[PDB]
Ligand binder design. Structure first.
Ligand code: ATP
Ligand code: ATP
Ligand code: ZN
Lengths: 603, 604
């Protein structure tokens, strides 16, 4: 197939002359674009007579109804829109497209050239006639007899500009997406453009292509590969230090990943605690609301309060309340609502079903109820904003105490790992208080991921036994990793993720704030990132800490001077990579992460 | 700063009319480019006279010496080549670039528009003059007085096309890189260009940009990000099954990574063995050459010969030959030469220095000699072709033999890990036994990576012990992972690399070859790849197996039906990520891997 597109102005001989570009072979069909000027109607009638006298290929003449003459840039813009739509309609395939640029204004020929360059064309050529005609024998063909004699005498020279490859993302557009209206006035069509959707789309695609090519060199330094389409100014903004007050909206709109979120520390105080209590199935058995005065300056304490006091601050919830089915359901639904409000795309909630068991409610029943509450919450949310939740069972070694709870939690995890295979799942266990792995072989045998929850001890020996004796894949609260260079190198090389909770660490350990340089007591985020460690920022306890994931992300701007927004994105990508999700969950999380919000202050 | 660029044809009045685009402000710099036709000269004197008055802006007129008419498209190409250089020299900055396409040929205005699009400019506009001038008041202004009247009567209409950013790869181009030969003839510069390098550069840049845009969609499925610049036909070629016979040249040129290579099994026979023996320091203690007949059909045996016979095949080299300093030096140099010939960019060599020690040569001396030979060989190679070599110490359990060597090798590795920090290094220890949990705590405490060299058995329990008790980061010859589903899932999730040797596994174990479809006994390479396991292809014993890394990669096509060359690239990337390298070595390896050879038979 071969389709020829030609533009005509005051001279009608351009079409018959360009029809002889291929010689005796001819064109399978020639299409002519025309303006609305009345000065060209005799040209149109002569072209129609020529076409009738030369039957064969399909003929169609298109006139721009709204373009009578070139008076301003608006007329040229409308002509460009109409020409693009007409080329799409009459030339669906760029390999079958032949374009002639003899006729039209000096801008119209450039319009055809640009259209061929963008949307592609098999060949773009210019038809010329040797001046030997007229009464003086110096003009070119102008009448039917003159055009016929010019074609016969071979007074025509064609300038073949060569095929135009076009662009990959503009070579796939189709006419039905952007239709064109044509009013037939005799054998010539009168076309018009209803709107400029096609041109706006083309301009946006070209701008996106320019953005992609500009940042193409150096794309491996970007966390999200889809982030390379950002404008260079926005990337420069991304490479700047985070502002805790200016970037609140951007951090809030970010799709985040949660990995350290204790379920029993969500509704410890405030209105959420009363909302949970009012949902109790047996309201008479609710324990009295004791007085738990928060330290002054919460959530930013003046001085560190210690792990024991931090634990004691959450005595109004947990095993006291969640032994009631109604309180447990309310806690689960409120936690899911809080996760949705913070734009979290993947969360791993760690719970202790054994603590919540009753005489008639075994730990298995409690775990099943928690899983079903989370699954029902997930299934009631649209997939475009659904936060996938997985469960970690918390086995804790307490001072003295009984070892039955640890065994029960391990067995419950080892059972739930195979019971559920879709939706909310038990993805692993975390070992809090354990350096002693003799009963942890079965969890490794069944493929359960293990994360070790580091405690008050600032012992490098604990982070060693977690890595090489507990076979931990994530370390929680590993703030003293830099004290042993060998351990830091091992953690970086083996890809063990270090999950950090800014507010919890500040309230328990305490770190300098709003510094200008990196000190000896400074928060170890930037040091870990510079060493190649996979660092993740989490919330720990939403209720006790009284800070969401966005607040934790923003607080790094104060804890670590010079923290950049790209490093926040790096932490999010590290959390996504370190999650215990499967293939489908990981691909869904990656799809969610690609939708990075656009900045609001340019650069 | 505002520079105006205009073309001039038969009508010189276009430049003065375009001079009033901004109004009274004018242009701080205006340049005129035209052809060498004699008809352009009177327009030249008219423009010079017009520049005599209104002397505000800077003036210059350029004429293409070799371009006069539109009678040759090659003239058009030369005109474009001179045009781009003239625009770069006269309009170095696109932001300060104001281009007018009123004058000149239609192709001249097209060149104006194309140059503005490619290189960028602040504004492209067309100037229109009312015909209410000249005799009869029916022609556009063409004289000094007529032009001034048109300017002073608001008779000029301007069509500002709008700002054009230009492509990123063409905006940073500089005039000095593409000089223009200008000769002064009065107030006009006669410009000429010696080479068409600018046009070729532009064409290559646009072609590469088109390829990158086409491949942008599938950017996460490409193991090497540099493959996005490949043409779409080549990318489609990359996704077809590997052909062992027609893809040998492409595989031979690939920058490969070696993770499983034994030093003592490189020159077990052939002319390499004779060269190593000739290089002996004392040619009287050399053991007599033992007659070891290779199994028929080598390197592709008719039937698998087992591990014991495969080990015995290399009895002419190793412990009973490498105790000679000259033999050891020749061994190391020949191994490095073989590595270079295969285009290997990173290699990890496994050696047993204790087995090569004598009364006057302690294991440390042997290890230091091996390291220094490899480092010296590396330093004599250019950095662009240099193959970085690291060392792995093999601690092999014996069948109730010696136990002192298993400790001496570990101590030697722990010492060498701290001794050397640049060039060749000892990066880990190889465990060829227990596949001992109390013997490797010191290894882990110093940051040494351990690779478990499984073999001569099919037991998932050994793999479990290696992964969880030995803390192995790589597994060798783990061909039975699929038999245990939990083990396969754990290996996939923990990012443990599996070192597969095609020729060695085929010779020892035996697998079906050239089978049309996969089966129960098929090679587990593609099954491992589909499960998310990081698989690597190595050589094991270069000498005993009698096959190079390229041979192994090609034979993987026969072992695994319908394997694509993109899978080969994926295996190379997996080997690069699984190497026990540091930041500098890893970045150098990544830089080397980015130079994927271009395919040659992408025509079907
Ligand atoms: N930041 C922390 N540091 C140390 N231990 C913690 C921390 N947060 C929670 N824990 C411990 O985790 C254990 C189990 O966590 P979970 O979130 O399931 O709490 P819980 O069962 O509701 O707690 P409780 O009933 O003791 O208040 C609890 O015993 C708590 O002591
Ligand atoms: N393909 C293999 N499969 C299993 N074990 C192997 C393999 N190749 C080598 N080994 C083990 O590695 C040890 C060292 O092999 P290497 O190639 O370095 O030669 P070597 O030091 O001369 O060996 P040897 O002690 O047999 O003389 C061998 O003794 C054997 O224990
Ligand atoms: Zn081996």
């Amino acid at each position: 197939m071969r389709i020829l597109l030609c533009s005509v102005g005051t001279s009608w001989a351009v079409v018959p002359e360009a029809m002889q570009l291929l010689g005796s072979q001819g064109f399978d069909e020639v299409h002519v674009l025309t303006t609305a000027s009345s000065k060209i109607s005799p040209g149109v009638e002569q072209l129609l007579r020529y076409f009738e006298m030369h039957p064969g290929p399909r003929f169609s003449i298109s006139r721009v109804q709204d373009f009578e003459d070139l008076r301003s840039e608006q007329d040229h813009m409308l002509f460009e829109e109409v020409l693009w739509r007409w080329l799409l309609q009459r030339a669906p395939q760029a390999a079958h497209r032949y374009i002639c640029l003899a006729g039209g204004y000096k801008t119209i020929s450039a319009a055809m050239q640009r259209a061929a360059a963008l949307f592609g064309a098999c060949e773009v050529f210019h038809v010329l006639c040797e001046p030997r005609f007229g009464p003086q024998g110096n003009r070119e063909a102008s009448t039917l007899e003159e055009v016929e004699q010019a074609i016969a005498t071979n007074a025509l020279r064609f300038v073949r500009l060569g095929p135009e490859p076009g662009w990959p993302q503009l070579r796939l557009l189709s006419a039905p997406s952007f239709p064109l209206e044509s009013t037939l006035q005799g054998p010539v069509h009168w076309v018009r453009a209803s709107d400029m959707r096609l041109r706006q789309h083309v301009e946006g695609v070209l701008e996106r292509s320019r953005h992609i090519l500009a940042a193409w060199e150096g794309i491996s330094e970007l966390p999200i590969p889809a982030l390379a389409a950002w404008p260079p100014s926005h990337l420069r903004w991304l490479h700047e230090p985070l502002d805790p007050v200016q970037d609140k909206a951007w951090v809030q709109a970010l799709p985040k990943v949660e990995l350290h979120c204790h379920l029993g520390g969500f509704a410890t105080h405030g209105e959420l605690l009363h909302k949970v209590r009012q949902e109790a199935a047996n309201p008479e058995s609710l324990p009295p609301v004791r007085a738990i005065p928060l330290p002054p300056g919460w959530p930013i304490p003046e001085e560190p309060i210690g792990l024991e006091r931090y634990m004691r601050l959450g005595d109004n919830n947990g095993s006291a309340l969640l032994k009631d089915p109604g309180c447990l359901r309310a806690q689960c639904r409120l936690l899911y609502e809080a996760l949705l409000a913070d734009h979290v795309a993947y969360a791993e909630i760690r719970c202790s079903p054994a603590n919540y068991a009753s005489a008639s409610r075994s730990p298995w029943v409690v775990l099943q109820e928690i899983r079903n509450h989370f699954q029902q919450a997930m299934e009631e949310t649209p997939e475009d904003r659904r936060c996938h939740v997985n469960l970690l069972l918390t086995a804790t070694r307490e001072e003295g105490g009984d070892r039955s709870r640890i065994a029960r939690h391990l067995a419950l995890a080892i059972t739930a790992a195979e019971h559920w295979k879709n939706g909310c799942r038990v993805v692993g266990v975390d070992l809090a208080g354990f350096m002693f792995a003799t009963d942890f072989e079965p969890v490794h045998r069944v493929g359960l991921a293990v994360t070790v929850h580091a405690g008050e001890n600032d012992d490098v020996e604990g982070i060693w036994q977690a890595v090489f004796k507990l076979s931990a894949r994530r370390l929680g609260h590993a703030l003293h990793l830099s004290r042993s260079p060998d351990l830091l190198r091992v953690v970086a090389e083996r890809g063990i993720a270090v999950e950090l909770c800014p507010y919890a660490n500040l309230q328990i350990k305490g770190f300098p704030l709003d510094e200008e340089q990196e000190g000896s007591e400074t928060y170890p985020l930037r040091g870990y990132l510079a060493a190649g460690v996979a660092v993740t920022l989490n919330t720990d306890n939403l209720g006790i800490s009284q800070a969401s994931l966005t607040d934790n992300l923003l607080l790094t701007a104060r804890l670590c001077p010079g923290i950049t927004r790209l490093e926040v994105l790096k932490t999010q990508v590290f959390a996504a990579q370190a999650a215990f999700a499967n293939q489908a969950e990981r691909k869904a999380l990656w799809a969610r992460l690609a939708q990075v919000p656009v900045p609001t202050d340019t650069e």
